Amino acid sequence: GHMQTLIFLDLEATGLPSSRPEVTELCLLAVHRRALENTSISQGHPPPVPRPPRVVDKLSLCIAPGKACSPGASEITGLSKAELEVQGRQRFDDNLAILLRAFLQRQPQPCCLVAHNGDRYDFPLLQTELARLSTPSPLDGTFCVDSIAALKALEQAKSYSLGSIYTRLYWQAPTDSHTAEGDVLTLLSICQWKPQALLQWVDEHARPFSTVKPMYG
C-alpha cells in the first residue's frame, strides 16, 4: 500500500501517433489512496455508477497546438486549433510545466498517473511534449500505469476502449466522450468498480514515468 496518490489523466490531441500529434487538452484528477479505498465495492447487475470522492484535486486545461487538428479529431473532441487560438490558449510551454509541477507538489508522494491506453498514447506523447521544454520534466519522480492492463487483470480474475468498458460495467453510455475531463471522470468511475483490487494492482505494476520512451523525436 505505497501509492498515496492516483492521478487520473487524459489528453486530447491533434490526431493519432503516426501524424506526430500535439496535445490540445489535458486533465489531471488527483485522488488520495484512502478516497478510492473507501469507495463502495460494486454490487448488483448492473451496479450503479459510483460517486466520485469528495476530496479531489482537479486540473483541466486547453492548449493551443502548433499544427492543426485532423478533421476526425476535431469532430470527436469538439476542439480546433483555430478556436483554441482565437480564445487565447497558450502553447505547451515552460509555464505549463511549472503549473503541472506545483499541482503535483500539492499531492502526497509517491504519485501514480492513471491513463486509459496510457502506455501507447498518453504517456509517450506527454513525454514528447515535455522533452521540447528547456526546464526539466515535472513528472520525474512520479509513477504511471495503464488502466487497460489494470482492468484486463481485474476482469480476468472484446473491446477495451474506454466507452466499451464503461457500458459493460454500468449499462450506461459515457457522458462527454473524447473530452479530457469527461474521459477522466469516465476513467474514475471504471476504476471505482473494484478500487481495492485496482489499488493493489497499481502498487505491483506501476512503473516510473521517466522510463517511458517518447512517442516521437
Place this chain on the structure above:
Amino acid sequence: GHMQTLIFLDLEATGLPSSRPEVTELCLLAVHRRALENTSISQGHPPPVPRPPRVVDKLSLCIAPGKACSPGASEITGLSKAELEVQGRQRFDDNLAILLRAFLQRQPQPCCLVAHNGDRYDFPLLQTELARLSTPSPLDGTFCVDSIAALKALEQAKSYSLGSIYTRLYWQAPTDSHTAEGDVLTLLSICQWKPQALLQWVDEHARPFSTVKPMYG
C-alpha cells in the same frame, strides 16, 4: 470591451467572517470573453440549463486549514480539517501561490474574477490568505467583480443566494451545492443567461483586486 478572461471563482472555508475563517477549497473556472458571447441567449420558459463553453480552463483544489471547521460549515460543504489532513492536503502556502500564478498566466489579460457575494466574502478572505505568504500576490494585476451586483443591475434594467437565483431562472435546484466546483458551475450557468449584457457590465465595474481590503489581519 477589454476584459478578455472571466475567471469564475468560489471558496469553501471553515466558517463565517466572524470566526476568522480559513480556505478549505477553491475553484477557478477561466472562460474567454468570446466563449460567453457565443452562448445562445437562453430562450424558453423556463430555458434549459446551458452547457459550459467547450474551451475552458478549470482548477479545483482542496486545502488543509490551520483551524477546525464550524459544525454548520462541515455539514453543508462535506469537508473537515481531519479529513483534509488524513488525505494529505497541504496548507495555503507559497507553492499554491505559484500554482495560481501559473494558471492565471495562461489566461489572456486583463483578467476579472467573478464570485457570488465576492465583495463581502470571497475576495477579502482570499486577500487575507495571500497576505500571509512571502511570495508576491498572484492576483495582483487581475480585476474582480461581484456577481450579485452584476445580476441586480441586469435584472433591474428577493433572496439573492446562488440557489434562489438559479431556481428562478431554470426552475431546477442546483447540483453539488456548497462545494467549490459545484458552486462555480452553478454561477457559470447563471452568468450564461445574459452573457453579452454581463460582459458589458463587467467592463464597466471591474476594480483591481489590489484595492480589495483583507477580511482580517
